[PDB]
Amino acid sequence: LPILGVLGGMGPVVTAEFLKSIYEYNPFIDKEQESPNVIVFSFPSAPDRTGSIDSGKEREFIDFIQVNLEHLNKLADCIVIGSCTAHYALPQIPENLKDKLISLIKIADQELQEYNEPTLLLASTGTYQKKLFQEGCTTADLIISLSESDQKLIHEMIYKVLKRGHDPLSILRDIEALLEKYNTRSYISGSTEFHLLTKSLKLKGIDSIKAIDPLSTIAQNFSQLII
């Protein structure tokens, strides 16, 4: 049977929620044995991703990701890293250790190609600094970058609210305002933590916003994506 390996904990809250999603969106028909087999390394003690860029110690972090990928390659058929900013370590990893990997950037890029309207990239300043989406996406011109002012306002929301486990709906008003400002009905979860907002939005049947959320897509299309 096919096994997804999640290198998570770079949002312990969101890693927990991601696994909930996997079974929410793949309910069994008769028996539980039908349902997805998953492995989760939820290690919060990964060095802070943006903070490791802001100080000198990017090597400490790349070493973390590399070691845990070697583990997961032995155990899982496909692999996902539970953090967009964490993808910056990938150019420094051996190509062989990334055969099973599923880039959250690539999953967003595909979704955005099909959606085909301008969309607001919500992400941590460290994701922005590394330009992971602008450098990684075929659809990079459809991405609307936040101004530096608003990148910090988003960094606030992620760390102060979402990662702490507070009600994702609490920032909904602030996001609707941003979507209005930059003049769009859609956003990209350029910070996996916005998986928590996407779920809260879908719960209340709020259809006005189109979320391009890689974790939601990986969950929903598990059966197709995992071989």
- Chain residues 26-55 in contact with ligand DGL, contact rule CB under 6 A: 49
Q: Residue 85 annotated as binding?
A: yes
- Tokens (6 digits) for 177: 């305002």
Q: Please provide the DSSP assignment of 169-211 as one string.
A: GGGHHHHHHHHHHTT-SEEEESSGGGHHHHHHHHHTT--SSEE
171 binds ligand DGL, rule: CB under 6 A? no
- Among a copy of itself, ligand DGL, none, what does residue 124 contact (CB within 5–8 Å per kind)? ligand DGL
* Interface with ligand DGL, residue 195, by CB under 6 A: no
**Annotated binding-site residue? 49:** yes
Question: Which of 21, 83, 186, 216 contacts ligand DGL by CB under 6 A?
Answer: 83
- Under rule CB under 6 A, residue 62 binds ligand DGL: no
Side-chain-side CA neighbours of residue 152 (13 Å): 2
Task: Give the residue among 226, 219, 223, 214 at the shortest CA–CA distance from 87.
Answer: 214
Contact flag: residue 86 with ligand DGL (CB under 6 A): yes
185 is in an annotated binding site: no
Q: How many residues bind ligand DGL (CB under 6 A)?
A: 13
Q: Residue 160 gets which letter from DSSP?
A: I
Please say whether the beta carbons of 35 and 23 come within 8 A: yes
CB 139, min distance to a copy of itself, A: 31
Contacts of 157 (CB under 8 A, 6+ apart): 171, 174
Q: Is 41 helix (H, G, I), strand (E, B) or coil?
A: strand
Taking contact as CB under 8 A, which single stretch among the options 6-14, 87-95, 126-134, 178-186 is the one that binds a copy of itself? Answer: 6-14
Q: What, of a copy of itself, ligand DGL, none, does residue 192 touch, CB below 5 to 8 Å by kind?
A: ligand DGL
Relative orientation angle of helices 195-203 and 12-24, to the nearest 10 degrees: 40
Cα–Cα distance measured from residue 160 to residue 138, given in angstroms and rounded to the nearest whole number: 32
State yes or no: 193 annotated in a binding site.
Answer: yes
Q: Is residue 11 a contact residue for a copy of itself (CB under 8 A)?
A: yes
Question: Could you tell me how far CA 51 lies from the centroid of its own chain?
Answer: 18
Q: Looking at 11, 36, 136, 168, which residue binds ligand DGL (CB under 6 A)?
A: 11
Q: Does 191 bind ligand DGL (CB under 6 A)?
A: yes
List residues forming the annotated binding site: 49, 84-85, 163, 192-193
